[PDB]
């Protein structure tokens, strides 16, 4: 059916990674030939879902933002649901939504810690897998809140298991890559090993891999507690040695979520998606 060349061509970024030794690409801006995926996945009439959590004072601001840009440049063309998680469903803002937009709300027992909070959406991602988001979309993402679309962010990140490359370390050598380096955690990475530092604010694929990731990332999470230690950066630890383990299909470039308080090199030609101030 489709192949990589249809789509894709890593020569035209030669001074950037596009491929990877494991055969899958690192979509950047120039790269990638949106119009023919667009007619590629409408004929499959594909639906991608979105997931986002957003408990305590993150709830009615940031999720503003979040959805408004979403619903604005987030698979523009392909049916979209949106599945919000929140603590107090007053907080939901009201957006209106464009064209094939649709979203469902769930109320979610916030945690105590703020770690546990964002390490939980593992747990909670996976059972809405399970119970309705498998049956309802083709691909998912899942995303935190405290970020804003800029730009298109289309069918090009589609794949079956979809990683982020953290824009602060993309460039930089493994060694000092911020894993977990304490091998009592099921996150440890040890130095010289290592592909790429992966941002756990996005991932994505088919439901089938989202569950595999959020459930090996919290068997992972719930084996260093039972141990009391906590990894480095918490779920995104966990994400960077699932990913390490299980190589993503499709990487994203740093422009598909990019910290402007770095600059703007000239790697960066087209910023779709950027941080929120932390
Ligand atoms: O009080 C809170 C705490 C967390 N979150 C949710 O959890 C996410 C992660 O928290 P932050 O965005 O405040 O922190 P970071 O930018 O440091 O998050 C990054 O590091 C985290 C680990 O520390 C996770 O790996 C996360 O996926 C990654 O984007 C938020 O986007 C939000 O969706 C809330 O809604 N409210
Ligand atoms: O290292 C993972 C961690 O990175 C944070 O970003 C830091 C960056 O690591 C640091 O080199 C730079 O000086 O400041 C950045 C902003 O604090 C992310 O904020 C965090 O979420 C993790 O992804
Ligand atoms: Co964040």
């Not at 523009?76 to 957006?95: A, C, E, K, T």
């Not at 979309?137 to 090009?156: I, R």
Request: charged share 25%.
């Amino acid at each position: 059916k489709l192949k990589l060349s249809d789509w894709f061509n890593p020569f035209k970024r030669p001074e950037v990674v596009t491929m990877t030794k494991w055969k899958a690409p690192v979509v950047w801006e120039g790269t990638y030939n949106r119009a023919v995926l667009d007619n590629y996945y409408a004929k499959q009439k594909i639906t991608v879902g979105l997931t986002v959590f957003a408990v305590g004072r993150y709830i009615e601001h940031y999720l503003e933002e979040f959805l408004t840009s979403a619903n604005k440049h987030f698979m523009v063309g392909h049916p979209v649901i949106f599945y919000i998680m929140v603590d107090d469903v007053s907080r939901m803002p009201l957006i209106e939504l464009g064209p094939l937009r649709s979203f469902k709300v769930f109320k979610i027992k916030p945690e105590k810690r703020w770690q546990d909070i964002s390490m939980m959406r593992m747990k909670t991602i996976g059972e809405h897998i399970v119970a309705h988001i498998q049956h309802e979309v083709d691909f998912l993402f899942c995303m935190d809140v405290d970020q804003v679309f800029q730009d298109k962010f289309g069918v090009e990140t589609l794949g079956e298991s979809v990683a982020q490359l953290q824009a602060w370390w993309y460039k930089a050598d493994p060694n000092d890559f911020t894993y977990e380096r304490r091998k009592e955690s099921a996150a440890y990475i040890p130095f010289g090993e290592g592909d790429f530092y992966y941002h756990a604010a996005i991932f994505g694929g088919t439901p089938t891999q989202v569950l595999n990731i959020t459930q090996e990332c919290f068997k992972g999470i719930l084996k260093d507690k039972k141990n009391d230690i906590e990894a480095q950066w918490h779920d995104e630890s966990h994400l960077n040695k699932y990913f390490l383990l299980n190589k993503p299909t499709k990487i994203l470039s740093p422009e598909y979520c990019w910290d402007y308080h770095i600059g703007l090199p000239a790697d960066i030609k087209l910023v779709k998606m950027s941080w929120q101030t932390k």
